[PDB]
Write a protein that binds this ligand. Sequence first.
Ligand SMILES: [Mg+2]
Lengths: 49, 98, 147, 147, 49, 150, 152, 147
Amino acid sequence: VKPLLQVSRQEEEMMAKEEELVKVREKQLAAENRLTEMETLQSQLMAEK
Amino acid sequence: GFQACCRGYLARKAFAKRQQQLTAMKVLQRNCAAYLKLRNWQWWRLFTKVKPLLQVSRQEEEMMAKEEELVKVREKQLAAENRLTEMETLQSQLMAEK
Amino acid sequence: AREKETKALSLARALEEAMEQKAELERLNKQFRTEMEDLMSSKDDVGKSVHELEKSKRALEQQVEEMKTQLEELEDELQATEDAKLRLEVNLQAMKAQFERDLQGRDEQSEEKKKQLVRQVREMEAELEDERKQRSMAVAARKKLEM
Amino acid sequence: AREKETKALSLARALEEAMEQKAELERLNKQFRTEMEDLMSSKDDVGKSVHELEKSKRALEQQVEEMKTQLEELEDELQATEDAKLRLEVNLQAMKAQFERDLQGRDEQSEEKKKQLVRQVREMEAELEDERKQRSMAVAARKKLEM
Amino acid sequence: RQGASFIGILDIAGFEIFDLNSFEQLCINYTNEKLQQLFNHTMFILEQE
Amino acid sequence: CDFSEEQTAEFKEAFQLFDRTGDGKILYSQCGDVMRALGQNPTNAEVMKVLGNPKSDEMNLKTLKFEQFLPMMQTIAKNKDQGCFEDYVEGLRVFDKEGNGTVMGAEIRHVLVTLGEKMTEEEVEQLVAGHEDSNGCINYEELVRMVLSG
Amino acid sequence: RATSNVFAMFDQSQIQEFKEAFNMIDQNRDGFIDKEDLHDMLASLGKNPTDEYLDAMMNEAPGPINFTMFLTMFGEKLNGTDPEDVIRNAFACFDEEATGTIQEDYLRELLTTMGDRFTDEEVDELYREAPIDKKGNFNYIEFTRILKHGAK
Amino acid sequence: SHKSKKDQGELERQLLQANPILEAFGNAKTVKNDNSSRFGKFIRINFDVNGYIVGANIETYLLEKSRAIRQAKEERTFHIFYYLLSGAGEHLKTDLLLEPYNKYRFLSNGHVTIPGQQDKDMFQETMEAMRIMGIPEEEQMGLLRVI
Ligand SMILES: [Mg+2]
């Protein structure tokens, strides 16, 4: 009966939505951290220049 | 004369604020008055304990809301990574200039 | 004069109340005249249509019941429409506050980032401003030597 | 003060007139009701029952008239309420659209002022470096004098 | 830090004479003489200029 | 009365909305603010005048009935010292030292707090709040027109 | 109380939720709560004890309760209440900084002073079960959950 | 910034504490002034376009650092040396290795008092001033350890 049930399909779809959201959210936070750090490196290299 | 106009405007604004805040209070206190008795009613506390079970009967809106959240986050992260790589290449050029 | 104005207002209210009482007593007396002509002239009569008089009374009572049940509908309809208006009012006000929150957030982020730019620019302008004075000193010192 | 005092006292005179007419009708109607009910009481009991039937039927007719009047007044109140609710819904939509426009205005103003700031800042940096060069020239011309 | 205008408040070390005056007092009394010349210049010279 | 009862019915409610005696009465200090809430612009001098020059403590203690408040409103409605927008803009321009249609918010605050019937700093900050620009300048024509039309 | 069509009191979603509730709550699924159906549910969901005294409330809705009667008895106590979102929006008129909280004393003052007034006893009777902070913050956001989805 | 959101503002409260601190470390009792400052300072207070305070900057001049080492026959060194030595608790005396006034030879006159003051209370006042200014206890202890 579980392959017949729709609720399991809706839960699976919600989990897929959440998982892909989490992937893009992790990339968002990592990209923000990387940009901030690298920008501080760039600014320090400007001062050294 | 102009101070009388300003003080009138201020009093009138504060009155309108009181008027809406009083309608909000009427809603709030009427609802809480009904709650005070209904809170203690056996059938209500029974139904509310059943409610988590019947709440399984639910609409699809959270999945599309998560789809929108995904899209917004994805586009922001792509922009952030593009700006990061532009800044990093510029920083490497600053290394060459140093 | 403005005291007399309210004295007159109060007495006008009293006069209007007494006149409404008089109008009601007139209605009563005039109805009682016709009812006394019924009491003492060929009427208060039996059997000829008393089943129809009962039918009319029952139909009137039925119409009162119909009006009362329609009122028991209209009272809840008015209650529900008023409650809908209250939901409208409270959501509208909260929406104005929410849009004010959005406007403040727009300013908070945009102005903070831009003002950080303007701060760095102002710190650079402080150097430009001191360079103005250093140049003025240099040219004044040369004019002091040129003599 | 005097014209309004004369108005107040004339209203008081009218109030006393209405009050005395009210009291006159009060005792007149009490007497008349007593005389009329004695003519019911003295009549035969079935005819007396038909008088109470007609009396109650007339009162029930007035009751149905008052009921339908009240339902008409409540219908009008309900219509005015629904018109007000629709007005609030329209005003909510207009307010939403207005704040949307204001938000787009804030976005465009933020972008425009960011661009203006950065562009003028490039000019400020160029003129700063120009002032650096011209001050360096002034001090070089001084040193070439001192030498 | 975007200050549009400022009020400055100066409180220098006041004019000193001890039983033993040293390099510290020379610099203090020089500063007091400079501030007094600022008063004289502002009041009597810039005014008439 | 020499006044339209249709709005007297509204004034009864708007007066009652000031409720803090627990009944159909309100205290002398409120009288000016209820008159300003009903749409008139009485000066504090006018408020004291119609109240018969009460003492500053009596203002806290003595009270009006609506039957006494209605003629107060009528007196202020029928006769007034109120100027107009075309006058007030000419008054504000006295502070316009440059002719651009703008005046300094700190100047307008200082003026309103110090001259005439002095306003509190809390009131005046609520007045100027939202009329900021990057220069601290208020456009007095629009400030006056907004306050007057408000 | 008034006798209108029952649907006017409830949004379609709310009466649909009551229909679901009653289909779960009727236990011998004859279409009616009887006292056994009630105590069966009460024991099945709740703890081991059963309280026949609750039969003195089942009787309150006359006869064996049809879904229209079940809805009637809930709706007549539930009337005079409003959605969670408008109750949060109502609290927003007082929490001017949108902290999500009002002070315990300040909410007591607000409730006792104006409109159709609460007694201080009724406010304290809210506080005897409402969420509260020993620092004084009434976290009204949680109170809106407790008033509709909660009650532990 | 007096406003509808009426407050005891942070920058106002901190600005008032700056002088008690610089006076504790900078000032000393000479024969001419019991609160002789021994440095010059220029306080620059910055105002926005609305005339509200947004920042202050304190510049100082010519500190008489030599006073730390040696003093004339009725004078004190900088007040903080006496605030610490008299106001430190036994745990602080132990942690900072503090000694009687007669052990130190940089305190040429030993313990010397100022009429109408108590160094043990001025110590607590100075530490409260440092707390209000937001100098954390590790930095306050760093200062006292260097002293
Ligand atoms: Mg059953």
